Write a protein that binds this ligand. Structure first.
Ligand SMILES: CCCCCCCCCCCC(=O)OC[C@H](COP(=O)(O)OCC[N+](C)(C)C)OC(=O)CCCCCCCCCCC
Ligand SMILES: CCCCCCCCCCCC(=O)OC[C@H](COP(=O)(O)OCC[N+](C)(C)C)OC(=O)CCCCCCCCCCC
Ligand SMILES: CCCCCCCCCCCC(=O)OC[C@H](COP(=O)(O)OCC[N+](C)(C)C)OC(=O)CCCCCCCCCCC
Ligand SMILES: CCCCCCCCCCCC(=O)OC[C@H](COP(=O)(O)OCC[N+](C)(C)C)OC(=O)CCCCCCCCCCC
Ligand SMILES: CCCCCCCCCCCC(=O)OC[C@H](COP(=O)(O)OCC[N+](C)(C)C)OC(=O)CCCCCCCCCCC
Ligand SMILES: CC(C)c1cccc(C(C)C)c1O
Ligand SMILES: CC(C)c1cccc(C(C)C)c1O
Ligand SMILES: [Cl-]
Ligand SMILES: [Cl-]
Ligand SMILES: [Cl-]
Ligand SMILES: [Cl-]
Ligand SMILES: [Cl-]
Ligand code: NA
Ligand code: NA
Ligand code: NA
Ligand code: NA
Ligand code: NA
Ligand code: NA
Lengths: 311, 311, 311, 311, 311
């Protein structure tokens, strides 16, 4: 129970492969996702080699404790994976074919810049630490890298699950470390966001703009202020389903922009009333009539500007 | 231990059976449900066979570690099942009768299209991976497939728990995989939804329609706007108890439709007031009188259209 | 390590007893409760018998692995109990006295029909599966069935903890199953509900009825509508602390009834205003004066009707 | 591996000691707190005695499985403690000095009568069950009872951690049980409650009292009703951070009292308006002028009465 | 399996090192953070010495149970760390090089005085208890102390991860304890707080100040009261994401100060109206005109005073 000895002075290549069985619980706020998959490992151990003609069997099955197995770990995991060894098969040349079924909560940062029209690249980093006898290098066996067709992630479209074939070999605490990158590309299902958040938020804003077709300050105050309270409720609802980003998000920009539109509408409503009391409604009517065109035009213009800056 | 050797070149049939003891925690947002059940397994191992006459005993009881047991796993589970082996009995012909009691959180997608008048088909997928010595095929023993009469799922009616007798045999990572489908059919108890969400949401909408029997713009603004705020509160309450679907739900359609009715009511209230100020209330009175009939008629019409499209 | 052999052809009686140490976490929505208790088990194993005179000792102490112990399980538990064996004592006749301390989350449905003036019967079902050698039957040893005096359940009064002495013996998967019923009777502490939810909800309803002593439609709309928003807030607060029941609850009935009172008050307020505008306030004043008596009388009458139907 | 034999007919005294390392997660609603501490145990086992001269060593170190250790449990815990044995030392006379580091979620009821100006006495109950060979009695070794200086409980001031030196010896299931009481005295940090809940709640109430300096019923309705909605929001916020008590709390009393003040203010506002419409404002002005003095005086008076009844 | 014997009378130096792999879940309310890191331990055990010539290997690999490993614990952890031993290597002199990968929830108090423009010093305390044979002293091996470049903490900037090289050696329960301090310095990413909470909270306050450009008491009441309700919503949203501190926070001060500004605005609105009714609007106009300048000036002044007191 030690690493296999090298024939010359070559590092031990451990061929890896992750096959996704179940994908679930993508927490946007925590930037984590739960995964249930197969982990396949393959290496050459010449000490386990046998003659197939004399043995009578073409493959030998071993228990994990009986043979040497590379200590393969995941970098971006909360806790160590819950694994159950499925099978260990040894071919006559000494090539081990290890398979285990694992479940782990993976930590992968998300880019909310384009939310809810955003795409993500979820990562799963495989790692091996080189032993004192010899160095261990990871490899990708594309034949054993894939996903089940049933694999569904609620509110997401699963594009592809590939692996960066070239490992990131580096020094860590005076020992070699071979790191592999498994990438799960996903795109957000933005459909629900339109009738649930986008359109209701636009309607309450358009309702506040009816104050531009009214001279009643008491009714105008009620219109602009109440709809602002509805927008504050909408802002709270959205910001709780998202983490605190050091960058501006597309939704964050719009929500903040809408706050300015309510503030400027309050100013207009205040100015309109002040001029009516000061016995000059001709100045107020012209401002109110201008606002009827200005508010939707500037809103459409600014939205085009924002959409261009983000997409 | 190792798999039992085949007499000819036949695959090993492992007869299965799931008997539900407890069903609980159906998370709609997570599309998961917790289950506590019996898992019965039966296979022929000729190496364990004995003569009942000289043994003196008709059945031999073994501990799990003593004999070979097929590695039976669940496909759609978050983590590996928590199992406690109940009994292992061996008949004289070598037929093993294994029984275990398990508990597992099962991942099964739900169809919210008809919510809260929806029915679901919960799945439990049993799976076995074929070994190098011989292939393992799963079978359904209908005698050991059932459920306890006490089995209750909060807010759901349990119809039936059956199994698709024919297994889905397929190739996975260069090995045969035998997959069985256990189906738990349930229907939602929609009763509570009527006095808690449906009727209160209709009442607040009918209260907004009283603005069609009033000329006071200040009172009308207060009526339509405040009731809209109540509907926004109701929308938030409903959408949090449901996951983000790429398709339209029945409740989602109604909620969204009601938003249009509030918006058009605001427009009516705005138009009515604008005409009263412009000294033409005959035009306003006729629009307001038409709305008294139009709003309930178009609402009833659209609801019939929606109910037909969904049911 | 097999069951004790029968002297004749009698089943093995395993005397049980549950002594509650701690009762906590009664989740109304989940219909679950956490329990920490002692589980006492007693059976006759003649193979363990000894002469007290020759042995010099009255009782022999064994480790769980050394002797045969019946596989006692709980039916209505989420996961298998966390148990620590306290003591195993054997008397000279071969009678084993087993004791363990366990902790388990128990699933017991609750009847919310009379909430918050409801009483519950929490269940703990003990079960044993008969082995092939002989049948195992459960029994109640009332001496070892009880509870600690400190045992407290937050917001509940603990009446009694008894056991149904006669077991439910039945056939399951071609084997005998002996099931015992341990009942924990509790009654809800309804005190808090009066100053926190009942009285504040009645006050906001009485505030809406002040519109019957006002002719100002603008003020009346504000009165009835705002108080309705407060009642919607109260409805949301209550319904979240309760699960979705297929039956009507006492609180559910009142909340729904109060919604009708707000709707009819809106109708009255609308009718009153319509008649004032139509230049016939004598008709409006008489309706408004009638409502001053009708609303509290019909409310008190309907509450008496509801209380009678539920209690 | 059995209890040490008595020299005469004396019970075995097991000297205990708890040294708090970390105190955290005091859940007020659940009435639980998490603790990380050292558990020291000391007893005399003459079978383990040795001559220091012949042995060459003054102290013998044993592994838990090698020697007999008393089964010490905690009464008021959710689940059995997570313990790691630190050290087991045996002096030449046979005195064992056991030490372990544990972590456990402790259930201790809290008295919310004086909340948020309340003090609590958290309990940790140590217990031992007497074996058949001899009786086990617990003792307090004050030298090994203490706490770390860094020990902090968020929003609480830690006064003292002492132990009731005299154990509660009692009979349970025909066996002796020795119970010890470890008391952790804490007092609530009420500072935050003043600018966050107390003062904002008083301000909204004083804002409602401005209706006593106004004749506008429409403005008065808006004043008293809106501020009541703010108080309902405050009531919901407070009651969620507290469990449902069968007794009245200090905060509960104030919140409920404030509801009466809003109701009486609505009555005043209603009466004032009714008299203005009935063409008798001299009666209304006198009532309104009286209320300007009555409301703050009766509020201050009732608060003094309440503070006296609770403190 | 006992500590290594000293050559003279020197304490055993155990060289430590923590290398952060993943940093996540910084709960502000709980004052906890989750960490996934490498724990390296190195000590001299002369009993494990070997001749590389005779053994055939330059470095001997052992399993944890085979050799003596110092009982290294963390002080400020909720529960004992979840560790997986990576490697144990022994050089021919007997120097052990232990490595494990751990995951633990660390308890570290935070200073919210400057929130959300605050910086924190997270602590990780390593500790060893001296055995009876010899004393164990901890040391820092700066070569094995570091962090991964990918290490990200959501909403935080990771400055440095260093260790206090000099251990805190002290007496505890009559035994020596060597304590090391690993410090993770972080600074809050305050960006999000500006468009999400700061600016929307300032806008609603400026909207309330429009009442200084209006004589309509009914509109003014609606303005100041509704915006106060929005500020109460904002206060609740902020205070839930923060724990109850016995000290004043920067955000806590501003929120509380804003409450005074709303109260004084209500007083102004009340005074203005009272004077208009008392037929003296010249006194009211002058107060209202003064408030137009006073409110923004005093607000800016007080904010400068607060920012100076906190920064
Ligand atoms: C209030 C404003 C409403 C939001 C408007 C859409 C924002 C936008 O423009 O969204 C854009 C994204 C698509 O981006 P993409 O093509 O996938 O990115 C690739 C970008 N390249 C080519 C630069 C690399 O969404 C859509 O398909 C728009 C559909 C939503 C319509 C909502 C109607 C209301
Ligand atoms: C606001 C609108 C209120 C909702 C109206 C009910 C929607 C509906 O029409 O619901 C329909 C479903 C029943 O569907 P099913 O027969 O089980 O489906 C099988 C469909 N086949 C035959 C096409 C295969 O619910 C009901 O039994 C209606 C009872 C609810 C009454 C609510 C009154 C208010
Ligand atoms: C607003 C609605 C007002 C609520 C009125 C309480 C409902 C009720 O009258 O509830 C009734 C229950 C009592 O029922 P029981 O005797 O325990 O049931 C056993 C019934 N048998 C014998 C038929 C099986 O509660 C009480 O003792 C009422 C005390 C609460 C008063 C709250 C006043 C406000
Ligand atoms: C609205 C009402 C605001 C609450 C008023 C304080 C209630 C009270 O009187 O609180 C009293 C407690 C202190 O009680 P104690 O001395 O520790 O108890 C021991 C009791 N003996 C001597 C009877 C045994 O708090 C204080 O120190 C008051 C500080 C809070 C000031 C809040 C100002 C606003
Ligand atoms: C309206 C009130 C809005 C808040 C105003 C900022 C508070 C402040 O003054 O914040 C100060 C902190 C910086 O503190 P520091 O330099 O890192 O501390 C070290 C302190 N020494 C030198 C005394 C040791 O934030 C900033 O960089 C200000 C950026 C936020 C701008 C918000 C605009 C709105
Ligand atoms: C406290 C709560 C559960 C409750 C009980 C009884 C009556 C009501 C209202 C509807 C008056 C109520 O909300
Ligand atoms: C974002 C939040 C924590 C906060 C920080 C700083 C200042 C304010 C006020 C001025 C809005 C504030 O609420
Ligand atoms: Cl891992
Ligand atoms: Cl499984
Ligand atoms: Cl169980
Ligand atoms: Cl314990
Ligand atoms: Cl630890
Ligand atoms: Na191995
Ligand atoms: Na086996
Ligand atoms: Na046993
Ligand atoms: Na022992
Ligand atoms: Na060791
Ligand atoms: Na109003």
């Amino acid at each position: 129970v030690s690493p296999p000895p090298p024939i010359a002075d070559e590092p031990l290549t451990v061929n890896t492969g992750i096959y996704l069985i179940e994908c679930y619980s993508l927490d946007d706020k925590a930037e984590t996702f739960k995964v249930n998959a197969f982990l396949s490992l393959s290496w050459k151990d010449r000490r386990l080699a046998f003659d197939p003609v004399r043995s009578g069997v073409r493959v030998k099955t071993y228990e994990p404790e009986a043979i040497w197995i590379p200590e393969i770990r995941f970098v971006n995991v909360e806790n160590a994976r819950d694994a159950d060894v499925v099978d260990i098969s040894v071919s006559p040349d000494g090539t081990v074919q290890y398979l285990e079924r694992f479940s782990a909560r993976v930590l992968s940062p998300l880019d909310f810049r384009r939310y809810p029209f955003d795409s993500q690249t979820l990562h799963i980093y495989l790692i091996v630490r080189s032993v004192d006898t010899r160095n261990i290098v990871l490899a990708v066996d594309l034949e054993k890298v894939g996903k089940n067709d049933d694999v569904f992630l609620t509110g997401w479209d699963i594009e592809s699950f590939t692996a960066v074939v070239k490992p990131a070999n580096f020094a860590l605490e005076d020992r070699l470390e071979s790191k592999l990158d498994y990438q799960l590309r996903i795109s957000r299902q933005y459909f629900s966001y339109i009738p649930n958040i986008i359109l209701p938020m636009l309607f309450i804003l358009f309702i506040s703009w009816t104050a531009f077709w009214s001279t009643s300050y008491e009714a105008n105050v009620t219109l602009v202020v109440s709809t602002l309270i509805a927008h504050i409720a909408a802002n709270i609802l959205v910001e709780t389903n998202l983490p605190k980003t050091p960058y501006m998000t597309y939704t964050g920009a719009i929500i903040f922009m809408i706050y300015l539109f309510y503030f400027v509408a309050v100013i207009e409503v205040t100015v309109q009333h002040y001029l009516k009391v000061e016995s000059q409604p001709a100045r107020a009517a012209s401002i109110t009539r201008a606002s009827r065109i200005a508010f939707p035009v500037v809103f459409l213009l600014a939205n085009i500007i924002l959409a261009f800056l983000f997409f």
